[PDB]
Design a protein around this ligand. Structure first.
Ligand SMILES: */C=C/C1=C(C)C(=O)N/C1=C\C1=NC(=C\c2[nH]c(/C=C3\NC(=O)C(C=C)=C3C)c(C)c2CCC(=O)O)/C(CCC(=O)O)=C1C
Ligand SMILES: */C=C/C1=C(C)C(=O)N/C1=C\C1=NC(=C\c2[nH]c(/C=C3\NC(=O)C(C=C)=C3C)c(C)c2CCC(=O)O)/C(CCC(=O)O)=C1C
Lengths: 588, 602
């Protein structure tokens, strides 16, 4: 239903009056039916008439707008065309666009902003959100006389929850009450980011329409997006009626230029909150929004700084010991779980796992790792940022439906199906209990949903992929040396030849003890020397052919002995190009 | 100096009146000398008298406070002791604490004032960047309130303030750009500015009327004015404002993420009183300036962090993609590697090798820095540093590398470890600063203009955590190196004719299993390479094998020594195969046998 315009209804809340003027001539092109009564001229002659003639404004004047449409705040207005029509003092404001303008007027009515000030310095300097959230609810319920004031905090999915609420001693609270995202469509949520503070004076009013529905010259309906005399959606009107309420004032809590929440208000008797008190509620909205976003900042900072202290202790201790013992890992578990605030963690290293804290069993961890690195969930890896994470496992991996009491959520590094070394942090099932609006009262329990993964705790995880490469390097570093030592404790005398790209000749890469001794010259002086160190012309030709063509050769040939003829077994080593790049040489 | 007490001066600015009441009855325990004149009754009988006697407060009343001390805003007050005491409208406010209270009163004055302020507060809430709004305040506030000079004093890291915005008269000279010492506003004062947001000196060099009972007659404690706006400021500051000429101040506090980001300092060279409605309009503009900038600081921060990660991850991917580090691979990495840290130069190292991109010192100079960093005397530096090592001025940290400053005056060196082989060095070249000072109980005026050489653009913490977030590219570089060398050698040992296999030693609950096995070894058993990897060494030999012979084999496995024994193999078909097991203990850093090489020939 979010498909409704609302910004272009063609109807005005009766309480005030609207007049759309052409900026060329200054003549009223469009006017609401409530205008003809206020001003001294019926709809017929009121239309096409120059605005100056019909209404007078002393404080400020409308003007020519280039591109940025400015607005003129609520100022004194008088009706010279009528002989005594001052049912109340009339105050008018302007919406000055480049194509056309819009003037809106409403009564003045009724120790105001100076009386608000204590409450704004009250919140300003104070801790946590709830404390400020209630300081509003309570402080606002006292300043503007409302029967129910509440703070409607939005979440990730756009489902609102009433965190703070100040009602009458009688009545029942909607505190704790969760509501659908659908109760406030995206369409509307936009308007309460433009047109900050909204007011429905009387629910079930008579909507007085803008008589020339479309612009007589432009052929376009009037955009009330910025107009505060806006006729709200009938979908919501019947909804407020079915909730009882006859009046509503909804302030927007815009934190770091985004809709964090609303200060929704309920008056069960009809009530008009004049432009003055309407701007007082905006002061308390922005003031709350203020140190909410500054409190969000303090928390953020404090956490970032202690998360790095942990992170770097891990980095150091990890790079320190060259031998990942079972004891090493248990000195790392209190801290590895903390840098991400997980309840469990499982360190993998090829068919091996090291479980710490509250993590599923050895076999279950393998079932998750198998299912993650899966071909159908290869799109998941593609889309994820630096690592993969779930808030509810039951959705992402339907096969792993269960496993939720231990791993309902997790973070997984590497994003790549690199295998060998991997890491998995896990937050177990955290059963929620959503007190609905009624999808009167209902109480759905959410199973399988773990504590939502913090982005602070998510970039700190990506800021650890260096411990996966640290793990992986240290593995190859040990295996290479194991094999180097191996080939060095051989009797067959072997050496590795790196192919020269015709820019250089075929030099030596690796050489074992048994090879360096048969020449006489030790290991250090043979590394980096050409294989071309008398011999038969036909025989060396066979040797160089395999070096040329990049093939194999076995030829008995004389050495440089202090003649030592030794058989040369040359084996081309596999290459990613297939093109021979290295050659193993054994001699027995 | 920062050790001066203030907050309990025992003196009041003459312009107003103070009265400390005991909350048990309502009796004035302490009173300022300026009270006896305005209240009527002299100091003698005014003391110990129920406040109810001079009470003429209609608007609101004081009350019993539990723990959180609330305040009552400026409301109408009168004096019933005298038939026409002043000819000026008097207004009083309250500071209600749980132990005692405090009532302060001052004139109402003239020049609706808040409704007229609203446009300007709307205009900043919309304004971009910190600066554009900082001037909207300075200019908008200078017009609203008649101050001869309004300025926005932004604190820098050290607590040295800089006047970023300033709205003065057409005459007089600007302090715009003027940097000041942190010492000019001690930490003890900076605290009070965070409690009392709006502050004013009506006349510099006033007669300070003291609170006659200096200490509480019951408590025995001096009055903590703090929250009291009639507070007598420090004489250290009074002589300072006098030496700057000024006769009146009005200093608002810009408190951003409940921390002192700045002040809206004001100067009136003629004496000036700022009323109750006035004082609070400047607070509204200070709650907005603090607000809009704290949220603008957030937007910027977020936008930068998110585009810093886009770069970071492009590097990560492209780096892990190609398995051989070509010079062109490094040529497309340079625009982005320099960006993720916003350095002017970068030098990628890989064992006596360097790849310089942008504005980095010469190949030889980079080696002189790398040598000096990994130095034994500067091993303490690596110990203390966070994830990586960084300098803002090289000339201090490495005095030997005094020069090199026009290219590498600052840098981020990583790995922190003297791991060598692979390393990375980002560098910001010399950025000659020009700090326009106030002067160096001062005589101020003179803008001294110190020039700072060898100091590069200060290293951003956003650019510092995005630097630690690249440490994985040194380990990526390093793994890929060993990954290639190991595999080169694995392929080597695999294309062997002797028939060799590596045995990983077992323990108390683990037997001796096989780590690596070649094709010449896997064929003599028959069973291919893949089945034998992980196979226990005790499987390999037959179950008919000589008791004395296997004992010799297991002895070398036990004691961790060498053995050479001809023994029968586990023959799949049933063909007797007896090869001479050459078992060589492989060198270990402990010396304790960890692995074994098993050659076979007999
Ligand atoms: C089409 C879907 C809708 C459902 C379902 C529903 O309940 N409302 C729907 C649409 C509209 N809601 C609009 C505005 C709106 N809705 C709320 C919701 C609540 N307010 C409350 O006080 C409580 C509980 C105490 C709830 C659940 C509010 C506060 C508002 C803004 C109110 C205002 O205008 O003052 C809306 C927009 C209409 C418009 O403004 O033109 C639509 C279409
Ligand atoms: C003991 C150290 C001090 C030196 C030296 C000095 O010059 N002042 C010292 C002490 C105090 N300063 C206090 C307040 C204060 N200082 C400043 C700084 C400036 N004011 C300016 O106009 C300029 C440049 C034009 C600068 C750099 C300000 C703005 C303030 C606050 C003014 C006020 O609102 O009163 C101070 C605290 C006194 C108090 O309020 O009790 C001390 C001790």
């Amino acid at each position: 239903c979010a498909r409704e315009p609302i910004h272009i209804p063609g109807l005005i809340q009766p309480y005030g009056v609207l007049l759309v003027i052409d900026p060329a001539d200054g003549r009223i092109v469009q006017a609401s039916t409530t205008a003809a009564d206020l001003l001294g001229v019926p709809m017929a002659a009121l239309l096409g008439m120059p605005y100056t003639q019909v209404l007078t404004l002393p404080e400020a004047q409308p003007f020519a707008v280039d591109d940025q449409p400015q607005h003129l705040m609520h100022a004194e207005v008088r009706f010279p065309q009528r002989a005594t029509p001052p049912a109340s003092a009339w105050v008018a404001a302007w919406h000055l666009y480049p194509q056309q303008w819009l003037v809106e007027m409403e009564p003045r009515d009724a120790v105001t902003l100076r009386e608000a000030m204590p409450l704004l310095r009250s919140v300003e300097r104070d801790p946590g959100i709830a404390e400020a959230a209630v300081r509003v609810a309570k402080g606002l319920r006292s300043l503007i006389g409302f029967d129910r004031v509440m703070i409607y905090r939005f979440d990730e999915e756009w489902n609102g929850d009433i965190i703070a609420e100040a009602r009458k001693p009688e009545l029942e609270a909607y505190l704790g009450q969760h509501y659908p995202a659908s109760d406030i469509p995206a369409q509307a949520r936009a308007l309460y980011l433009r047109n900050r503070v909204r007011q429905i004076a009387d629910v079930g009013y008579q909507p007085s329409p803008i008589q020339p529905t479309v612009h007589p010259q432009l052929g376009t309906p009037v955009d009330l997006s910025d107009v505060s005399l806006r006729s709200v959606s009938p979908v919501h009107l019947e909804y407020l009626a079915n909730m009882g309420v006859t009046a509503t004032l909804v302030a927007s809590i815009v934190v770091n230029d985004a809709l964090w929440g609303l200060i929704s208000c309920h008056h069960y008797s009809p009530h008009f909150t004049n432009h003055a008190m309407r701007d007082v509620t905006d002061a308390v909205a922005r003031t709350l929004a203020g140190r909410i976003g500054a409190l969000q900042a303090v928390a953020r900072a404090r956490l970032e700084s202690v998360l790095l202290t942990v992170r770097e202790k891990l980095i150091t201790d990890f790079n320190d010991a060259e031998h990942m013992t079972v004891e090493l890992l248990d000195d790392m578990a209190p801290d590895l779980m903390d840098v991400v605030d997980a309840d469990g963690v499982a360190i993998f290293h090829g068919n091996d796992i090291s479980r710490h804290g509250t993590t599923p069993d050895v076999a279950a961890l393998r079932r998750i790792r198998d299912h993650i690195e899966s071909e159908h969930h290869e799109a998941l890896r593609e889309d994820a940022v630096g690592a993969l994470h779930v808030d509810a496992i039951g959705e992402v991996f339907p096969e792993l439906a269960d496993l939720a009491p231990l791993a309902a959520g997790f973070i997984f590094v590497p994003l790549m199906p690199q295998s060998r070394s991997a890491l998995l942090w896990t937050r177990r099932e955290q059963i929620q209990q959503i007190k609905w609006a009624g999808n009167d009262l209902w109480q759905q329990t959410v199973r399988g949903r773990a504590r939502r993964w913090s982005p602070l705790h998510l970039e700190s995880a990506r800021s650890l992929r260096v411990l996966i490469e640290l793990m992986e390097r240290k593995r190859f570093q040990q295996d290479f040396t194991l094999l180097e030592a191996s080939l060095s404790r051989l009797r067959d005398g072997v050496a590795i030849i790196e192919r020269g790209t015709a820019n250089a000749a075929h030099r030596l890469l690796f050489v074992n003890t048994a090879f360096a001794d048969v020449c006489g010259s030790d290991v250090a002086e043979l590394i980096g020397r050409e294989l071309q160190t008398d011999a038969p012309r036909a025989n060396v030709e066979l040797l160089q052919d395999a070096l040329r063509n990049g093939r194999a050769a076995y030829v008995t040939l004389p050495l440089q002995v202090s003649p030592v003829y030794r058989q040369f077994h040359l084996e081309p080593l596999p290459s990613p190009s297939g093109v021979t790049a290295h050659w193993l040489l054994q001699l027995r």
